[PDB]
Amino acid sequence: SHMIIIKLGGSVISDSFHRHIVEQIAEEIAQFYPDESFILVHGGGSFGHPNAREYKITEGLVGDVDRKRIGFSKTHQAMLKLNDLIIQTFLEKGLPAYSVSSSSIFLLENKEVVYGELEILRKLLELKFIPVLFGDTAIALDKGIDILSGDQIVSYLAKMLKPSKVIFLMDVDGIYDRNPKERDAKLIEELNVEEIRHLLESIGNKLREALKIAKHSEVYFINGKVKENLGKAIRGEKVGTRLRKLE
Amino acid sequence: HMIIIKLGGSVISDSFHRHIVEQIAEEIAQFYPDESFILVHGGGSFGHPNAREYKITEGLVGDVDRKRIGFSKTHQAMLKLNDLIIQTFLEKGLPAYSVSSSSIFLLENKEVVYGELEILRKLLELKFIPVLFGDTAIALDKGIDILSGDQIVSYLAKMLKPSKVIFLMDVDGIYDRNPKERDAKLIEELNVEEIRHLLESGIGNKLREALKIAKHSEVYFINGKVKENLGKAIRGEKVGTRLRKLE
């Protein structure tokens, strides 16, 4: 199954669009298209988080339900705008990135995907297309509405489609000790389960979802600012933090 | 209890006629939330100039890479038009939500042979107004194709079985011949025999799809550029062309 999932962070695409960044990921992906299939998932940044926390989407369909539904739709549109920005950046570089609305195929419960539709994603990957999903608002079976993050989408896609690897693009070089902003913090080039539990005792949700994904595919945590990193993660070279498939 | 409203391409656009969209929004607001509504708006002056250029109807033939690029660009333009329509609906207080047609529907022979409607069902249950659009689509036979709103509403009528399906067109309804031709008379009560005659001698596609929708729901053909025409069509009053449910 020649397929790799790539999670674009929210801080590597915005804070304002980072066009040169997305150009770099597109240039790096063009090295393997179309022999290797690729799925991308991008989060919020100056688009999704403002409207998501302004209308209290995570609160659910409680209180003023009409305003909550209106803000639900508004946040969906605001995320579609940034998705269009990314799609145009990918199309200018010759990559046939196709937008797939996350809220149109996924249903939520306990901030997790309990219902999904993936035949369209398979048909896109088969026809040498590159699907682009996003952390979105979503319908939740428990609290009416919720915020479906990109990590949960990646987890569901890893459990179902079973990619060869999942590569997270973060602002730091990878999984560090304590906090990367500290003066002393060594990069974990080889991350395992016990280390993940150690850091979880004290990100956080990302490491939980990574522990879940490692059951199906390898996981990479690489710095998205460096262009050559992604390729090194696709070819399997030593870069950033690597969590091998569980045995 | 559910009403499927199809918005014609020559109605909403051809360029964007925002005033008539506000008019339609008020018309539906006169009934929300006593009834559930599914909107389907055509291509208009957004998806037509792209699909007619890139020849998406020809399929994945010739320059397949350029065809994929045009696929994605057409989807993005349709998303832009859908964003305009949904913002217009949101300003009127109605909670309209975007549903990408290419994310849940698969095509073969210009017809939906695979669909996903659970998210649509949950949206209708939570008092939302799902808005779909004539969109690019993955065709199982020719790779890529153009899924029109008529096929969308046909599949949705076969599946969800709404109470009635109202087509907003540039004309007052179905005429015994071309409305451009003089002495044109508007058919008040439409039946299968007149449809057979009009087909045996665009509009023909809409008649073909209405013949299939009539087995599940009552069809209306009214002028979209006239406000009250919608309400009279929802209240079952005499307006435009009326196609009773088959028996």
Ligand SMILES: Nc1ncnc2c1ncn2[C@@H]1O[C@H](COP(=O)(O)OP(=O)(O)OP(=O)(O)O)[C@@H](O)[C@H]1O
């Ligand atoms: N041990 C650690 N390893 C890695 N990052 C750490 C660690 N401790 C703290 N951090 C901080 O966690 C932050 C990671 O941000 P976060 O997990 O919220 O994701 P993001 O960039 O917002 O996007 P996304 O969730 O879409 O990937 C960084 O700013 C980093 O400094």
Ligand SMILES: Nc1ncnc2c1ncn2[C@@H]1O[C@H](COP(=O)(O)OP(=O)(O)O)[C@@H](O)[C@H]1O
């Ligand atoms: N017998 C007829 N009755 C009414 N309109 C007709 C007839 N024959 C042709 N037309 C015209 O043909 C056009 C077909 O447009 P159509 O494909 O329905 O647009 P859309 O795809 O946006 O719904 C209509 O604008 C209509 O004016």
Ligand SMILES: C/C=C(\C)COP(=O)(O)O
């Ligand atoms: C609108 C969705 C948001 C802000 C969450 O997505 P994430 O950044 O967790 O991928």
Ligand SMILES: C/C=C(\C)COP(=O)(O)O
């Ligand atoms: C790009 C979508 C198209 C061309 C379909 O438009 P409709 O027939 O629904 O008006």
